[model samples]
Target chain A: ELKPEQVEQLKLIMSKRYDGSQQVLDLKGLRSDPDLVAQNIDVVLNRRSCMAATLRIIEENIPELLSLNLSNNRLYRLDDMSSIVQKAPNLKILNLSGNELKSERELDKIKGLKLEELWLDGNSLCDTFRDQSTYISAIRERFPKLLRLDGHELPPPIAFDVE
Target chain B: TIPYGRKYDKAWLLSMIQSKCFTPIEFHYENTRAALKAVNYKILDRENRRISIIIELKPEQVEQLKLIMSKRYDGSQQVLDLKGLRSDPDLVAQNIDVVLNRRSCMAATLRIIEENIPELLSLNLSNNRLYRLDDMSSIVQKAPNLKILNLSGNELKSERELDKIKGLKLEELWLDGNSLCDTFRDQSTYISAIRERFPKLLRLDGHELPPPIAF
Candidate 1:
């Protein structure tokens, strides 16, 4: 039941202990705040961003969050995401699979993320499955530590044929 | 007629030799292992009835034997039976005593002791990792028969919480190696908030023994 302003106040109180070293914050219920995207400017932890609003918040406030999970959300395209990563230099895990991304053009911006896990499953990109596999292969070739490329290996196309 | 006999099994001879280290003043077997290792010798009374164990051991050895017996004995009785033994009866009686360690099992230990060991006279849980004393109220309420409690090396942040155990018949309380710097800042007056609570206690070890209370 926490509002965005309350979340902001909690962040201010937390900044006292932040000392640039505090690691974890549990912000589970602050979803309805209008300023949710504007308030988390100082959180520096192994972050767990559960909502699209959380990603927006990190994009606006503290972009140094290393791990983000925005799996089930209304986010589309990777246009503004690369700009956010210029600030989040340490971002390693980015989950953006359950979104409206149908083409690989949006993925070119993610090259700078150095991500270990990228979730692109349950998307329209699988309609032209080989294209998606080629894109994953290209991403894996770029980022060798990319262990999961869209719920499966991107180097080899599976037996599914596009109807 | 073991007669300080060295002719018995080497293990029994070793046990007899080890028994010489204990003072005859008290008996306490630490665990069930000690109880099983202990050899029960028989003594004949004037009426020719078997009276007690006739093992003549030193006081320290008796204490060690009691520890061993207490650790090894799995008897259902809460109090150890050493009435007929010629060793220190008090220490032997305390052989069934159990001391809890501080870890995942501390809260469980406290609960078990409160529920089961109703007549526990002394409890020594020193040098453990317990830091909070909030749960001691249950212990005080349940174990009203407790007399000696050793909570040394616990590094308690405050001693004021000890006021909860005030009227629980506690005679010897050991709180040394704890963070009692502010509580007992004055060594002479020793205004231990606990001392003010338990007025009838005779000995409060690890701290300066208070002046004898005037009758």
Candidate 2:
């Protein structure tokens, strides 16, 4: 049973944080938002319980969301965010830096969405890889369209992509 | 019989009052807060739905507006888009002024272009509610290299207002939504009127025109 006031609070945060001109939704350290902090709303997305409600609010507000910044939320798993593939089909850039992802498999959860830019620095999965090439291939295998990873620009994809 | 009028809470009252300030995108939060402290209102009637909160445009606020306009310059394309200045979400939310129309606002904007983007190629001043362009004549001097100029959806009532910005070598000009458009007898008269001013105009209201008839 979701409280009416909490949904209003979430919508407020989404409205202000959303850069309508750029179609970017910045949820990085969202719990620290002045309005949320004033209202004492704990919006840490890693809790799993509030994940569904949180995604629903984002979907409703900016269904055509292009870029999402979820940095510093300490997310260890991403299975909960799999629905975002369908919810935000045009999503091209995702910033998940400073999270606690354990392995590359965590990224496989949302492989359906074609991502061009991604950030995964400061995560445990980065340490698991032996070399840069291995890490590039490991992540590239999941997102063939990825052009930039962890702030480093990769070579263009060799696919016969139809414009 | 609504006896006990809806007593506005602190948050609602504060937000409503702050929303009336003429803030720019640069000082939206700072000036909104500044307006709250600077304003002194005495609510005489509880049922009064309207309240006026006025704050003069400070020197610093004008400078901030200039900064906001300067950021709109796309150096790569040499384009400055100032369309619907009042409708920018940051300004619209706070009920700020239509930036490019006010004398001070236009001066600051033209100053930014004159100093920074002197080689400006395309300029969009559409939907700005501009009544006259006498003050905006400096744009012809400031953006001397301007090729494309969009002034659609403004309130320029006559071709006399368009004559103020005459010196530009604009290739494409948009005067579609202005009242001046309806004043002409036909498309030929309208085209002839504008051709006299912008001789190099290749496109008018997005349509290619025949090269100006030789004398």
Candidate 3:
């Protein structure tokens, strides 16, 4: 939650757009105003906003939100994601390609299930697998509902493949 | 609706404001506190999500090991690590980011040397994140003395991204296991494009390039 000063600071930071800046919203007075909570804002904080920033937005309780993007924020834990799965149940699009996420194992806990598109590119987890293609294959096999992955549409399933 | 809108108790208003700021006070039996706590009050604490190979070694001893590291090699032997390199930057040995992405992470690690570690020599950033030219310009700026660079196992999105990677002391480069690496086998201009990028590159991946036919 930013003070009036940090709100002003956020303005400056956004305008300046310095190199390597996290660009997350100033947490000066974070949850003080219901109208100002991230739930109401489509693009809440920038790259610098932490999972806790995400937590507050989920608390704001906009159950109808359609898109969630958390890019390059150094969030590499399943616990961080388990929270997202539980909180943002109506999420349809999720962009998490650039961040250092923990692994694909956490995909087991995702609940909303309506996720049509997800971006998991550029994370170290994909590379750690023995076969990088297997990682992509697993994502497709596991999340049949996902239509597009990391911005690319998945190949249509074969007729013989049982759902 | 409570007809007493603003006329509601001052105590209530203050708590209302406080709850929004995440220091919740009980709200008109609305039970907003649980949701507030669940949302974690915004301005969330960042966990260190950067997972990399942890080779716990001190500075001086690290220098002694000229670790020939890579993921393309056999995993049974060992693995090289990188990304905002957590180890001693001044170790004067090889540095690799096997599964790490982001070129800036490498630049940042080198900047630390400009801060704490020291000079540089070789770097191996395979199987992680990287692209063509612009992505590497910073690392080149940081380690002007770079002798080896492992850019294999990555998606250099721009073929011409390496067009900007010129006039460095780079002698060896690894371009195996990448998307565009196989395309050049048919093109005679293969060495020409690469030579332009790294003029001093004597060895590529492990193959010794024939010196340009000085026709």
Score candidate 1 by lDDT. Answer: 0.50
Error of 3 at A81 (Å): 36
- Among the numbered candidates, top TM-score falls to 2
- Docking level of model 3: incorrect
Candidate 1: tens digits of C-alpha lDDT, residues B1-215 = 23423323435443553553232333333332113124444433345543223443345644454454364333453432221222334433444222223322343444445445657677766665456664354454445577777777776767765643454566777676677745666655554456675666667665546665677
Worst 10 residues of 3 chain B by lDDT: B48-57
Compose the digit string of candidate 2's lDDT tens values, residues B39-133. Answer: 43433345664443343466665565565677777889988898987666554554456556775667666757766786889999999989878
Off by over 4 Å in 3: A1-163, B1-100, B116-118, B185-187
Cα lDDT for residue A97, model 3?
67
Which residue ranges in model 2 land beyond 4 Å of their true spot?
A: A1-163, B1-56, B92-99
Off by over 4 Å in 1: A1-163, B1-104, B206-215
What is candidate 2's DockQ?
A: 0.01
- Candidate 3 or 2, higher lDDT: 2
Of the candidates numbered 1 and 2, which has the greater DockQ value? Answer: 1
Q: Report, for all candidates in order, the number of backbone clashes.
A: 33, 0, 18
Candidate 3 residue-wise lDDT, B1-215, digit = tens = 12222334435543553455422222232222214333222322135222111113345333333232222223342223442222333332233222224444443433343333224566666655466444344344345455777777777754565644553468887777767766676545666777776776799878998886766
Write candidate 3's Cα lDDT for A1-163 as tens digits.
5455545433443333222233222232223334344333322333323343444344343434566655554556543343343345456776666657658865643432467787777778777778646876777664677778887777765558678
